[model samples]
Target chain A: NAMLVKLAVLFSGNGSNLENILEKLHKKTIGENTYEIVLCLCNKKDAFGIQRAKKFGLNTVIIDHKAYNTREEFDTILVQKIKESGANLTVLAGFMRILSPVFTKNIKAINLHPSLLPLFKGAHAIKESYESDMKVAGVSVHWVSEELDGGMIIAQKAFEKRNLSFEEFEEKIHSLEHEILPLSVIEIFS
Target chain B: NAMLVKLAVLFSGNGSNLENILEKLHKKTIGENTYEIVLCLCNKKDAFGIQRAKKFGLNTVIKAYNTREEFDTILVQKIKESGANLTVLAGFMRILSPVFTKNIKAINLHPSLLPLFKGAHAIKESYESDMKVAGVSVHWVSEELDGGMIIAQKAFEKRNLSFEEFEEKIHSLEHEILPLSVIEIFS
Candidate 1:
């Protein structure tokens, strides 16, 4: 039989997004073929996500930013590792580092951002929208690009409200991020 | 009846360190001063530590760092909203962005010592040390810098073997420092 679709999940924090993806994979709900989450990479060694990934018996790698002299150097090493792992698709489950165009173009990478594309494109987006008193906020899963959150729209969802507080807005966006990210992976692989 | 110490505890991961501090404060072991963990900030909204903080009625802030400029702006605003109280850098696991240091200064801080083990491998450093013992210490938090004056220190005798064994020892050190630091503030 052909090797299971090779999936590499990248995370920077608690691995909750990776957890969501794993849940879908376990349920056999992700795609037409079986895919293995072969490797997990975290920029920080002590990130809880690294532990989480290890608990699941996934091969985990920590590429400390401090070890690299430059961001490009780090990305080059990362690209080499992903290639070495034989990953057919890369899923950015809150892997917080930005990639260069050279890196993104070389691999099939997708990222899950907490806000809808083309708006609230950067960090603390939920807070930005909430502080500005905007009515809507949600998650977007897009192809990875060198520019921050700049990628082709694969999936996007928005939560609507007239006066949601910051925490409320954040919770809603997180829920959306979890829901849409896995679905986007399904769509991409399908 | 002075204003309660409105402290913000920042945790980047599981928040075991924050949990230890809260437990100490609740037992009255940290003293008669009334205090509140006004806000809990995390880089990831889904961090278990944030949920733990919220369960205890503390406000929680999740500032995702999609862009450094935007994250910094919101972070400063959130600290201000938390009533500009003292900032306690618990296991606030993420490396702070350069902009994160602009407004906040650590009134008191805690570190798993000896100071030479500054980054992710501090505990491992201690475990591998020739010293037969290790300890925990509290100091004033500084911007980006991990070292400052030594506030309090508690030492533990080292035991035999393994990388895993050494890591567990570090937890004991963390537990020792967290409550003592809180008590020092009240004293």
Candidate 2:
């Protein structure tokens, strides 16, 4: 029998994207393919995605970034926990951490970035995209690499800037994230 | 300043996609790049895209033909008359014969990530298929229906979307990508 593909989900903010993945993948199968969210790791103690994970009864682990002296130290523990969970894949959804090789090299993972990558690579991408003169704006999912947001793109969806306000732009970005993140999982496992 | 390019837009249904292009490029210049909707041609007399074209003071032509050959023959003539270097098919619901495809340099907008769904009912077909994701494609117009070289595509998750929601998402992607394709092709 094919075992459930184990996934370790990581996030650091509003888990709206995380919830979308949960709705699609957590303990679900699509034509003999399925996933088990073995663990949900959040770096911030007060991150809301942690609460969302608990609602789904996922094994939520919080490693406070402030408690660690260096980013490597934080990732060392992260790699250890993810490996200990036996996660076949890791999904970074709004996980506001620039991963080092400590995690990227050891764990196979994918991440959701708010903007089309090699363009806006860090936080505040939503704001950056909104203010840019670019005619189209969208979201991307990519393989998680040591270089921040510098991974091979897995999927993308764009919308016209067409006189949208900041709030509408951010809303569209989130909606794109919600759609792309789930299907990316399906692509990986199925 | 840049040279003004010309476009011939062909459609057979509601021209919401046509209207979007009108808003973006019709007589407007972006960073010295610009275009004029030189002609708006629809095969059906009652097609709403004709109304949309008229609203913008575009020269609208309606031709109802008896055969694909006759229709495309007229199409070639009309497009030549408008001096459009590029033809854009936005919901132009006809399987083009070689009569037109062999003559015009054109791009088309289809509602699915083509090579997957290729017909008038692409939206419903994409929705009903087991595809985990749904999308839109802009491609070169070839003899085969929707079987052209894809120029650009935009995709979204199809998980749990109602028929109405899925159709709306498809339309949104069409609006975004088709105009961008035009800008890139001519710029």
Candidate 3:
């Protein structure tokens, strides 16, 4: 069967990671297979990533969480959008919202986290990892479940802390995210 | 009168190096002196660095020119407009013509040690070449491609490592010395 793996990427805030994924896997053929970023969903109306995705000429949908009355309502709409996009896999790249089982169980999705799983697991992971005594820092891509940033890890890459400042550490984490997230997408298809 | 040293950053592809510099020195004070990334000039409209620059609230200029000479002229004009004290090329893919080299006071980060492997595939070239060591170089931008006066360099023994390992070492060195070179020049 001739088929292309379609991806629906969700994001909030800056879409640096999203841009990285677009650059790597968007409309490209890998190992007799092909893929496209069929949809880019942004939760914030004012998010800069929307501009980034638009610049790439990808179809983007903005669903403001504030407009919805409940989390379930938001997830229901989100699931509907993903289904409409006809995406084979959903990728959450820096998407800030938590998943209700309504969405998690319904969608096959993976998430990009800033730190190694089972360690630093939240939005503050970069800061917490930098402040902790741990000498190594890294990024992880995992299956998205009802548990926030808690799923089977797909890939992880670590680097020495090397006494970098907080800003430097944050940049390093972002760099790792850019490196691993696209490979995760390729791996999912491969 | 105390003044903030203005910088004009040029990048062509993924702005990972540009991001590192932004994180390290975009608007931070060093030794009682401060700096601002006044302009981020990219030749490719689709380059990811443009988004990274805008995300940091830095002024970004994107243009694609058919003629190399015209592109360099516009690059010089924009760099002049920013009143940049220094222009740093971070993964900027185009080989700038003499117009820019002569007019702009710029520095560049090369993935492999200069005076050796030069060009886009420096990391792979250096790794595959019969070299004893691999490193990164920060150098003054000149008419020659990757052939400027080397300001500083950091090298590590090749030691029969995998291509991925060597590539990562080169990048880590770049992340370290590129910022150091920028700070050293201004401070």
Candidate 4:
């Protein structure tokens, strides 16, 4: 049977979300022959996800921004690498860098944010949600855009918890990211 | 002055181990210009670590092996791509496939055991010992072969509990391993 979908995953840090997605895919719960992680891209040379990709034997590329003079230059190489990989979809598991307009427009990219969209948009989304006394905190898988996490919402899952500490809230957010990211990827390609 | 150390991380399943190591590396407390996760390797194409590697803009490879023949072919390719960096088995959490031996050798690999209990279920040690009173353990990184040198160990505070106390103990073990592994990796 022919493959149904091709995906490229992007990460910056540990790649926990990427591991969650792969586990789901391996279980065949997502779909039969529905997806392949065509390429794994990272912005840092030392990022752990690169090693994770090697263990899996996936096509991997590193285009560290520090090597380039400008973000645009970095994205140029990044976009070219993505194009070369023949990926149908791009998912940012924990990718940290903001996308340039050109980069955003050139590819179909999605990101899993630790907080629901239009509410928390940066590094401390989980912490922000907890400090603001929000009843629930969750994850959003959305289309990538030039603006940070300002993208079309593809899927979101939230859980309510009142008076929780920051650590508790963070754990919930991580759990939500694992559950929602793969399901959203399945749904998007479905 | 020179790029002294290059490390490749292998994670399967959740990549939580990879996340743990990366968090430590980001703090820059591990050492001075001593370590870098040069490549990330995952056995499943859809492994979350692949995504994480891409996000960080690190080089990554996802090799899928349906058969031994296919696995070995791809394994060698990934090894070459990683430039033969020192391998660290963070969580590449799966048991190694036979074909995987061809990849770079690991210098330090984290395991969830101490002198008492060495293979899997270090938590069970805590549960069995003094009825949830004993703590967790962390030791020197090793090859799959056991008997690596002792690295670090930490005991948890005693907690009185019934069988329902499973979740709390598990959390305690995870928390303990996180710090212990970081300190061991740095040391």
Q: Per-candidate TM-score, first chain only?
A: 0.91, 0.95, 0.97, 0.91
Task: Quote the lDDT for A40 in model 1.
Answer: 85
Model 4 has a DockQ score of 0.01
Global lDDT of each candidate: 0.69, 0.82, 0.83, 0.64
Q: What is the per-residue lDDT of model 4 for residues B48-95, given as tens digits with 9 covering 90 to 100?
A: 777676656665666344576676566556766767455666655554
Q: Which candidate wins on DockQ?
A: 2
Model 3, residue B144: what's the lDDT?
Answer: 79
Clash list (residue pairs), candidate 2: none
Find the 10 residues in a row with the least total lDDT in model 3 chain B.
B128-137
Best by TM-score: 2
Cα distance off (Å), candidate 3, residue B34: 43
> Fnat of each prediction?
0.00, 0.00, 0.00, 0.00
lDDT of 1 by residue, A62-103 (tens): 899889888889999889889988988899997888787658
Per-chain TM-score of chain A in candidate 3 equals 0.97
Q: i-RMS, every candidate?
A: 23.8, 8.2, 14.3, 19.9
Query: Candidate 4 residues A1-190, lDDT tens each?
Result: 4465778888997888887766676325454556778788888778877766766666457777788888888888888888998988888899998778768989999888887555678988877766653334567778887777777776766665545677877888898798878887777765
What TM-score would candidate 4 get against the native? 0.48
Off by over 4 Å in 1: A1-3, A26-31, B1-187
Candidate 4 residue spans exceeding 4 A from truth:
A26-29, B1-187
Per-candidate interface DockQ score: 0.01, 0.04, 0.01, 0.01
CAPRI grade, predicted model 1: incorrect
